[PDB]
Ligand binder design. Structure first.
Ligand SMILES: O=C(c1ccncc1)c1ccc(F)cc1
Ligand SMILES: [Yb+3]
Ligand SMILES: [Yb+3]
Ligand SMILES: [Zn+2]
Length: 607
C-alpha cells in the first residue's frame, strides 16, 4: 500500500503508457494539454479508477471518443486531490483502454519552477524546469503517482520557437507548431518503463556540447564551456558503472546543468541527469555527484523502491555504487575516506533530528508525512553503512559487488520492498546465512539513531584532517600564532572539506580562532561550494558578524537545499543576523523554488 498516493493501487489497475501533448505558456505560467494514459485493468469488472492530481485544472476526460464523468475529491494537503473517473464500459482483467485527460497546471505547481529572464544567465528568455521526485508528478499531470507503477511515455511539447525543450527521454525530432508559427514542437520517446517520478521537462535557451560517445552537456551558453570540462570524466564513470551494474540500457547519458535554484545536487532523470551549477568548482572535485546520478541508472531507475518508505533501497545502493566508481578512479583508500565522511554526515543527521526520531530509521513509515519534510541523509548514509557493514561481513568488495550485479539483474524493471531485498540477499548468500543471522536486522532496518555496529574504515587520508582539526580545537590564544598557510600544503580539496567538517562538528569555536583561520588560510577566497558552505557555517555558528553578508549571499544566490537550508537556519539561530535572515527569506520567497520556499519557511518558523 503506497500511503503517499491517492490513486488506485497497482493491484487494481496499472498505467502502461503516457502520451503527453502539451504547450508551455510562459505568459500564464501554465502547461496545458492532454495526458493520454493507456491503463490496464488488474481486476474483473472494473468500472472506475482514481488518479492523483495536485492543483490541476481538469477540462474534460475522454474515453472511446466521448466525454465521461469524473469527480475531484477534497484536497488532502501535500497529497493533493484524488480524481475518480467513471469508465463507460466495465473492464475485464488485463483489458487495456486509453483515457485522455485535458488539463492545465497551476502557476503554483510544486513540480515546477518558472524563471523570469532576469533569473537566467542570458537575461533575455524565461526558463522552466520540473522536479517530480518524490510525489510532484501529480502537480504536472494526472497519474498514478506511485513508484510501484512503471510506464513508458511519448511526448510532444510546444514552446516558443527561440527556446529548446528537453525531457527524460530520447529526443525524437522537432517541427514548427501547425497551430502557431511562433512556436516549435519537440518530440520525445521513453521506451524503457519508468516510475512517474522520473518524468522531467526543461524549457529554455539551451545549447549543447558533446563530451563523450553517448553524452552531451546542456546549459545556457555562458555555462557550456565550464560544464564540458567539469564533467569530462562522465564516460569513464559510465564505463565503470556498466562493469559493476551490467549494461546501460537507456541509450543516451546526457547532462543538464540547471540555473542555481535547482534544489538538489543532481536528479537521476533517465537519459538526462539534472545537476546543480554549484558543481562547477573548476577542478572536477565535485564529480562524485555525477558518479551518484550515473549509478541510479541501475539502482533506482531499473530497480525501484515500491513505496517511499523504502527510499533507502534507491539511495543506499546508489551511494554504495558511487563510492566504488570513485574507488576505481582514485583508489581504495579514497573510497574509505568518502565512506568515513558519510558516517560523519550520518552522525550529523542523527544529532540534528535526535537519536530517537522516527526519520532516523532506515525504513520509515510515511503515512501522514510529507516526503519532502522527511528527506535527509539518513537513507543515503545509514543505507550505505549497512551495505558497507555487509560487504565486510560477507568477505569483501569483490564478493559484495557480485551480489549487487545479481540484485540489479534480478529486479530490473521492477519495484521492490526492503523484504524483497532481504529475501534475495539471503538467497544469494545461502552459504553465509549463519553470518547473515548475526546481523541485528531489527535495529539496522527499523530502529532510530546511529547503527548498532560501525564498519571498519581505513583512516590514511582522514588522519591529517583530524590532526589539524584537533590542533585548532585544543589551541588556546597563545597557540594561534603557530598556524600558517603551510598547514594546508599537503591537503587536497577533499581533505580541506573534511578538516572543516570535523571542525564544524565541534562548533562554535572561539571567535578569535575563526578570525585567525581566515587570516592564515583565507577560506573566504575559496569558491568550492562544499568548502565554502562549511566554512560559512563555522563562521556563523562561531558568531562572526563579518560572515553574515557572505552567508546571506550564498543562501540566496543559489538554492541547493543542502546549502540554502542550513545557512538560513544558522543565520536565524544567530541573534545578530536573525532579523536579516527572515527579511531576506520574505523578500526572495516568491522567486524561490516552491519546495525550497516551503521548507525554509518551516525551518525559520515563518508564516
Ligand atoms: O520521503 C522521502 C524519504 C523516504 C525515506 N526516508 C527518508 C525520506 C523522500 C524521497 C525522495 C525525495 F525527493 C524526498 C523525500
Ligand atoms: Yb524517430
Ligand atoms: Yb599556552
Ligand atoms: Zn540519489
Amino acid at each position: 500500500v503506497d500511503t503517499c498516493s491517492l490513486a488506485s493501487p497497482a493491484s487494481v489497475c496499472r498505467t502502461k503508457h503516457l502520451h503527453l501533448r502539451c504547450s508551455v505558456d510562459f505568459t500564464r505560467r501554465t502547461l496545458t494539454g492532454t495526458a493520454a494514459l493507456t491503463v490496464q485493468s488488474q481486476e474483473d469488472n472494473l468500472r472506475s479508477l482514481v488518479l492523483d492530481t495536485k492543483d490541476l485544472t481538469i477540462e474534460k476526460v475522454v474515453i472511446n471518443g466521448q466525454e465521461v464523468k469524473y469527480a475531484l475529491g477534497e484536497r488532502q494537503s501535500y497529497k493533493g486531490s484524488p480524481m475518480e473517473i467513471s469508465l463507460p464500459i466495465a473492464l475485464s482483467k488485463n483489458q487495456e483502454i486509453v483515457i485522455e485527460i485535458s488539463f492545465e497546471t497551476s502557476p503554483k505547481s510544486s513540480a515546477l519552477q518558472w524563471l523570469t529572464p532576469e533569473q537566467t544567465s542570458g537575461k533575455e528568455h524565461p526558463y522552466l524546469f520540473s522536479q517530480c521526485q518524490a510525489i510532484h508528478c501529480r502537480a504536472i499531470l494526472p497519474c498514478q503517482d506511485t513508484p510501484s507503477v512503471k510506464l513508458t511515455y511519448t511526448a510532444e511539447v510546444s514552446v516558443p520557437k527561440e527556446l529548446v525543450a528537453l525531457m527524460s527521454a530520447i529526443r525524437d525530432g522537432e517541427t514548427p507548431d501547425p497551430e502557431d508559427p511562433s512556436r516549435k514542437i519537440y518530440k520525445f520517446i521513453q521506451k524503457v518503463p519508468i516510475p512517474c517520478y522520473l518524468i522531467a521537462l526543461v524549457v529554455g535557451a539551451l545549447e549543447s556540447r558533446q563530451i563523450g560517445p553517448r553524452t552531451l552537456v546542456w546549459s545556457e551558453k555562458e555555462q557550456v564551456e565550464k560544464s564540458a570540462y567539469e564533467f569530462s570524466e562522465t564516460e569513464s564513470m559510465l564505463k565503470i558503472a556498466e562493469d559493476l551494474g551490467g549494461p546501460y540500457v537507456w541509450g543516451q547519458y546526457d547532462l543538464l546543468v540547471l540555473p542555481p535554484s535547482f534544489p538538489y545536487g543532481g536528479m537521476e532523470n533517465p537519459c538526462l541527469t539534472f545537476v546543480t551549477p554549484t558543481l562547477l568548482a573548476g577542478d572536477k572535485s565535485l564529480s562524485n555527484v555525477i558518479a551518484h546520478e550515473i549509478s541510479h541508472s541501475w539502482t533506482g531507475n531499473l530497480v525501484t523502491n515500491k513505496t517511499w518508505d523504502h527510499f533507502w533501497l534507491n539511495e543506499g545502493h546508489t551511494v554504495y555504487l558511487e563510492r566504488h566508481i570513485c574507488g576505481r578512479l582514485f583508489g581504495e583508500k579514497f573510497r574509505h575516506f568518502n565512506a568515513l565522511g558519510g558516517w560523519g554526515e550520518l552522525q550529523n543527521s542523527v544529532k540534528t533530528f535526535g537519536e530517537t526520531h522516527p526519520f532516523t530509521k532506515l525504513v520509515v513509515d510515511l503515512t501522514d508525512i510529507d516526503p519532502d519534510v522527511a528527506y535527509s541523509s539518513v537513507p543515503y548514509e545509514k543505507g550505505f553503512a549497512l551495505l558497507f557493514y555487509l560487504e565486510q561481513l560477507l568477505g569483501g568488495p569483490e564478493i559484495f559487488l557480485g551480489f549487487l550485479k545479481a540484485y540489479v539483474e534480478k529486479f530490473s524493471y521492477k519495484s521492490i520492498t526492503t523484504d524483497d531485498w532481504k529475501d534475495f540477499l539471503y538467497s544469494y548468500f545461502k552459504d553465509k546465512v549463519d553470518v547473515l543471522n548475526q546481523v541485528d536486522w531489527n535495529a539496522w532496518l527499523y530502529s532510530p539513531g546511529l547503527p548498532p555496529i560501525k564498519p571498519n574504515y581505513d583512516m590514511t587520508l582522514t588522519n591529517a584532517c583530524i590532526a589539524l582539526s584537533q590542533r585548532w580545537i585544543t589551541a588556546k590564544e597563545d597557540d594561534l600564532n603557530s598556524f600558517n598557510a603551510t598547514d594546508l600544503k599537503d591537503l587536497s580539496s577533499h581533505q580541506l572539506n573534511e578538516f572543516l567538517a570535523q571542525t564544524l562538528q565541534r562548533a562554535p569555536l572561539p571567535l578569535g580562532h575563526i578570525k585567525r583561520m581566515q587570516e592564515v588560510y583565507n577560506f573566504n577566497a575559496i569558491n568550492n561550494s562544499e568548502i565554502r558552505f562549511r566554512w560559512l557555517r563555522l563562521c556563523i555558528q562561531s558568531k562572526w558578524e563579518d560572515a553574515i553578508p557572505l552567508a546571506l549571499k550564498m543562501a540566496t544566490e543559489q538554492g541547493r537545499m543542502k546549502f540554502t537550508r542550513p545557512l538560513f537556519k544558522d543565520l536565524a539561530a544567530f541573534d545578530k543576523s536573525h532579523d536579516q535572515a527572515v527579511r531576506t527569506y520574505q523578500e526572495h520567497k516568491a522567486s524561490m523554488h516552491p519546495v525550497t520556499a516551503m521548507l525554509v519557511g518551516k525551518d525559520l518558523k515563518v508564516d
